[PDB]
């Protein structure tokens, strides 16, 4: 029973991972073949860079401005910067923009979203002056609409690139996200790879590795069938016609529980998917963005993401129906997520109730083996030995995502981490009950000594990985090369 369940769990996980690896490799080969035919100095499609953010760090904002300015392309129509807040303390980033670009803040009287005239020419007079935006704080979603209107007024603009205020762009990042959409008329949206520059914290490095694995596996598998989810965000491109025709539905929608400043991206991706147009993802473009370094902040972000996914899963299935002979993989993955969550919860409950040493050791060894296989594949793909630290991601995943998902499902004097504390107390009580019930020493039994040896080996491996990670931080080997110059420049202020 338990052994059969563990075996089927392991074989299903291995098969799905192998299939996703094959799909990602096929997509990468197709993209490489497409790139091999790219002519030199290709500037067929114009780019309109739109930058939005709120409470951006001055150093991070300056670095992002330098990175987008350092981008090399044949022709750029303009750069659009939209700032969510217009308070006195919010003028710092506007003045920073005046240090890098022209002083064209031109504070609008009111946000254009609820304005009677939804035309960008009301607040903009010249298209070549790189106008800035200082709107009142009314939500991050409203900020993107103003930039979209500003980009849409120019008939010469054929596509736009969406980048966050904190993200860091490369020299060829802009070209790599606009080339794929031009070759195929069906393809209209391109997603760029996102990376985390800072990895000093154990949580930050695990989050970075998880993001890298997700982008290189799930995004590639989705792009093979051209059903990419969450295409938008940092380092993201959109064709002008689709965004022009779907701007109104994306902004006129209402929600019951909305954050003060969240920003909706899954809804935009789903709205793009309604038209049936195909979306591809490329890993060649590289973007660098920060990640939270606090456990509570990471838990809150995961809860918000889970709530958004649960809200949007209703409309996610409808998009797959529109596509002919396509989207079945997306629907299967969407069902697989909830099936996997329910099955892992049931397995955890069963192993906690039974409190059998043989079953727990077997399942923990299977989990360690599959995690080691995944880490080895990530190291082989990334050509870096730092991917072997992904084994410790299981602990933080189990301790954060599951309470976050439970809280998100329940939602749909903080009273946000209460469910997390209840889950921690429950798992601690289950562990105490398991260790108390199985309190004996019988070295004669082969099964008991085998379980003890296995658990001791697992603990030794975990301790060794923790020790090598800890000494790596002092050696500073685990520090990413990009963040070294960042902290050096911050020190040399």
């Amino acid at each position, epitope marked *: 029973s338990a052994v059969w369940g563990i075996s089927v769990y392991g074989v299903f996980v291995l098969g799905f991972y192998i299939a996703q690896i094959v799909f990602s490799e096929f997509n990468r080969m197709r993209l490489s073949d497409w790139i091999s035919l790219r002519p030199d100095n290709w500037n067929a499609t114009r780019v309109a860079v739109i930058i939005a953010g709120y409470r951006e760090d001055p150093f991070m904002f300056k670095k992002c401005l330098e990175s987008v300015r350092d981008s090399e392309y044949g022709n750029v129509a303009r750069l659009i910067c939209v700032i969510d807040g217009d308070e006195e303390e919010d003028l710092k980033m506007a003045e920073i923009y005046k240090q890098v670009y022209n002083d064209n803040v031109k504070k609008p009287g009111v946000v254009l979203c609820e304005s009677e005239n939804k035309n960008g020419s009301t607040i903009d007079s010249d298209v070549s002056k790189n106008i800035c935006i200082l709107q009142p704080h009314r939500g991050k979603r409203e900020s993107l609409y103003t930039g979209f209107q500003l980009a849409s007024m120019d008939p010469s603009v054929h596509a736009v690139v969406l980048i966050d205020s904190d993200t860091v762009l490369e020299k060829n990042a802009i070209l790599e996200v606009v080339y794929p959409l031009s070759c195929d008329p069906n393809i209209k949206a391109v997603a760029g790879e996102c990376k985390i520059w800072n990895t000093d914290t154990i949580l930050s490095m695990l989050v970075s590795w998880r993001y890298f694995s997700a982008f290189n596996v799930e995004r590639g598998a989705q792009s093979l069938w051209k059903t990419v989810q969450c295409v938008g965000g940092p380092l993201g491109a959109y064709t002008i016609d689709i965004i022009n025709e779907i701007k109104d539905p994306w902004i006129t929608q209402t929600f019951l529980g909305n954050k003060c400043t969240y920003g909706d991206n899954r809804r935009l991706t789903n709205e793009v998917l309604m038209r049936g147009k195909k979306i591809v993802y490329t890993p060649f473009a590289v973007g660098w963005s920060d990640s939270p370094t606090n456990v509570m902040r990471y838990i809150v972000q995961q809860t918000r993401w889970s709530k958004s996914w649960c809200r949007e899963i209703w409309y996610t299935l409808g998009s797959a129906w529109k596509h002919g002979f396509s989207g079945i993989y997306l629907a299967f993955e969407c069902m697989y997520q909830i099936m996997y969550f329910f099955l892992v919860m049931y397995l955890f409950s069963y192993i906690a109730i039974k409190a059998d040493i*043989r079953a727990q050791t077997a399942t923990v060894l299977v989990s360690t083996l599959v995690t080691i296989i995944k880490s080895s594949y990530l190291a082989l793909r990334a050509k870096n030995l730092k991917a072997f630290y992904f084994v410790l991601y299981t602990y933080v995943y189990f301790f954060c995502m599951i309470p976050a998902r439970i809280t998100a499902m329940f939602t749909m004097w903080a009273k946000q981490f209460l469910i997390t504390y209840m889950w921690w107390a429950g798992v601690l009580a289950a562990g105490v009950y398991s260790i108390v019930d199985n309190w*004996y*020493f019988d*070295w*004669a*039994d082969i099964q008991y000594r085998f379980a003890l040896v296995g658990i001791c080996s697992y603990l030794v491996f975990v301790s060794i990985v923790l020790v090598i990670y800890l000494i790596g931080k002092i050696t500073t080997w685990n520090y990413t090369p990009l963040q070294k110059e960042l902290i050096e420049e911050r020190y040399l202020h």
Partner: nanobody
Framework: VQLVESGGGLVQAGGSLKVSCAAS????????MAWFRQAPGKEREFVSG???????YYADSVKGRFTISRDNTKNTVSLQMDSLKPEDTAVYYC??????????????????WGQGTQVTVSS
């Protein structure tokens, strides 16, 4: 833990008998139950035993000779007497062990004992 032995009797050769060692306490599955025989001529020798994980252990010519089983419903251990012969006439005892070493045949390994029961066979 308290161990009480009950069963036994006088039967002909090749008969079947059942011996059970009643026990009680806070925990019973953790304890390791083994059966020891004692004859007037010699000392106590290991014949059969069961571990916490229902592992079966037998002595020489006990692998298929006798069967040992335990259940947690009534917290007792029972052994089956198969193909009884006069040379097997000995006093049977049951022992419970929580912490022990690698060895199990040694008489002093088990720190608990019981009153025991008398089994006698003649022909």
């Amino acid at each position: 833990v308290q161990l009480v032995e009950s069963g036994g009797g006088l039967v002909q050769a090749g008969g079947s008998l059942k011996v059970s060692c009643a026990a009680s306490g806070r925990a019973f599955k953790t304890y390791r139950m083994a059966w020891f025989r004692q004859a007037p001529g010699k000392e106590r020798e290991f014949v059969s035993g069961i571990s916490a994980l229902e592992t079966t252990y037998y002595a020489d010519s006990v692998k298929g000779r006798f069967t040992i089983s335990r259940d947690n419903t009534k917290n007792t251990v029972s052994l089956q007497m198969d193909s009884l012969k006069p040379e097997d006439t000995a006093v049977y005892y049951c022992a419970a062990r929580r912490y022990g070493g690698t060895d199990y045949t040694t008489t002093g390994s088990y720190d608990y004992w019981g009153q025991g029961t008398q089994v006698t066979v003649s022909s």
